[PDB]
Amino acid sequence: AENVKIGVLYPLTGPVAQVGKDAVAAVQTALDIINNSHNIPGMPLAKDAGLKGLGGGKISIVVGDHGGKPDIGVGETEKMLNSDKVHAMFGAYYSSVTGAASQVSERAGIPWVNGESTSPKLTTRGFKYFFRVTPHDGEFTQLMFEFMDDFNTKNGNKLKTLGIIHEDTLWGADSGGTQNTMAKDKGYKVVEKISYKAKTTSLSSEVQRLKAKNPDVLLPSSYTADAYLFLNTAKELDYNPKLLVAQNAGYTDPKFIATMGSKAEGVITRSPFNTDLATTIPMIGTVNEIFKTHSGGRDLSDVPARAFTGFMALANAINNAGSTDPEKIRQALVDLDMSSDSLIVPYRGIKFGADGQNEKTRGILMQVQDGKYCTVYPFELAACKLQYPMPTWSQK
Ligand SMILES: O=C1CC[C@@H](C(=O)O)N1
Ligand code: NA
Secondary structure, eight states: OOOEEEEEEEOOSSTTHHHHHHHHHHHHHHHHHHHSOOOOTTOTTSSSSSBGGGTTBOEEEEEEEOTTOHHHHHHHHHHHHHTSOOSEEEEOSSHHHHHHHHHHHHHHTOOEEESSOOOGGGGSSOOSSEEEOSOOHHHHHHHHHHHHHHHHHHTTTOOOEEEEEEESSHHHHHHHHHHHHHHHHTTOEEEEEEEEOTTOSOOHHHHHHHHHHOOSEEEEEOOHHHHHHHHHHHHHTTOOOSOBEEOOXOTTOTTHHHHHGGGGTTOEEEESOOGGGTTTOTHHHHHHHHHTTTTTSOOOOHHHHHHHHHHHHHHHHHHHHTSOOHHHHHHHHHHOOEESTTOSSOOSEEOBOTTSBBSSOOOEEEEEETTEEEEEESTTSOSSOOOOSOOOGGGO
């Protein structure tokens, strides 16, 4: 009977704090399912109290607030490795932070599982100890363009021009770059490609430029505070894009709609998760009920669903390893091949390629309609019709 300790790094203060708090609540939800005995058909690890592979040993976590700062994330990772002696790492939301921190654990030879950082570059580093469960922005951008192509075929090929606007750290830069490359390859004309700092107090120059150019599709990659600033500024300058397809995250912050209210109407984002999938995936309801007891009564959303899924992958790998030895955990992650049966996201399973990326991911697009995100794509998996054009400020 052997316990295991995992380090968990997220932003728990600052502009994206609710993201981090709800992610940690999701991990705590997983720990509740793992460490206690639960009757949940279809969910590995539920029935046993603790991991059968560790003789009933319990998982514990040590949690660090990195504040969105890569250098802090690096320092916290070092302390978790060297002082806390964690046997695996989990985190860390921001691609910038995940990249920097996972380089430390890589060199230490300690497995790092990521639930929700989407820079494509994180899995092209030649690493051996890094495993990512979320789709990355290559996959999510592919989905955006499949949607634009299908809309085009149905609507006279009227979506011709794109405006890309992105925050300037790893995630936003790679997101915007992925979109730009794919645009060029698919014949779409990029008429703005704007980089900005997430901590900026003004986006008025950027919004003026986008309004003047008036792209057919607006493609923002923003964190929470900057997403709010962007939308507030757009309203203030009466900038009315007809289609806004966001790379999540600010647009999937747990409190995005609560904060923005009618300002969010018509916005589209990519996601692997929506509660309107629960008739197709009833496990969502089961886990949601448990999550509420950890989240202060708030429902699952994108980031907690992804973090929960990621942490379950790690837990299952440890169980399968029958060991807390970091090398055996790594090998169990290499060997992992989970079906979709236990999942709360519409992935086909969890199975990593040689680059550490989950091969079985899948995403959706969802649109704010009447105060809730609703699945709109693919057109076969949709809870409602796309609203196009987006309402103008005066109509929201
Ligand atoms: O899907 C997401 C959430 C955070 C952001 C990133 O990788 O920084 N992408
Ligand atoms: Na259990």
